[PDB]
Amino acid sequence: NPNYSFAGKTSSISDLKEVPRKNITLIRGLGGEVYEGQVSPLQVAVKTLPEVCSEQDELDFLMEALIISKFNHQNIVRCIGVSLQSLPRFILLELMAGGDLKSFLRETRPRPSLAMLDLLHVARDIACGCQYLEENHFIHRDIAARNCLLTCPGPGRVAKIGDFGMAGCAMLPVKWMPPEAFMEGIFTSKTDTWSFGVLLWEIFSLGYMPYPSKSNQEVLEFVTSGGRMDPPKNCPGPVYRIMTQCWQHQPEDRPNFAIILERIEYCTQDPDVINTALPIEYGPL
């Protein structure tokens, strides 16, 4: 893994707070496996390492805790502690009661709630987290709505970057990947920029699958030939323009996340943008 060597040298197991297993209570499943837990009371999310897994997974599990614990930013999920001295091993994580962003968007579509400014705040939150990660030379490699988490559903919600770790050629999230990534296996901060553009599309489409009527292979051929997605319905031009800049064919021509964050902030200053009505779904279609 491209992050293990650096994290291993510059972060200690002693940095991880071992919580006695007796003080941890699993309350319910949320979605290895992830539970809502309680520490004696702190409310937490608990990721488990299934006992059937291997020694490579042992490393992967420890490294997830070490890597998360390395960061300190409001828009990146917190590691709260660990319980590695008991089986199955736990990682204790910030509980995000809003759930994943993709599910949130699909379930909160306006029906016969959300406003444009709400979407912009989510995008700003994640862009803020990405800028922090870029500034610390960390390449996420799977920026997507499915890996973004929300503190709560209502106003004042905060979005944060996580990684559920779901990512052969059939497992590649090709629809979030720039050409140099899915053709050459090259990952940089500018490949995260591309993915963020696709995340923006997800957000302002209110949770549609990217390239809705296309398979992965069709997208591969589409994108390598210069093809790009059209704007989501009712998407403001300034927002779409950010997407298309994230999707420049050459990474050198894509903005960094400092620029992306600035441009999103500018959108929140434009009444014509934030007063744009989101589309409304008519049941009978």
Ligand SMILES: Cc1cc(-c2cc(NC(=O)c3ccc(CN4CCN(C)CC4)cc3)[nH]n2)ccc1NC(=O)Nc1cc(C(C)(C)C)on1
């Ligand atoms: C694995 C995981 C889960 C959570 C986690 C998940 C949760 N909530 C839920 O899972 C959940 C699900 C459903 C609902 C219910 N609904 C909400 C409201 N209702 C109305 C609709 C549905 C509520 C909460 N809270 N916390 C956190 C962290 C991680 N791990 C993780 O990030 N690792 C990463 C991170 C990194 C970076 C940052 C360096 C890239 O690298 N490794």
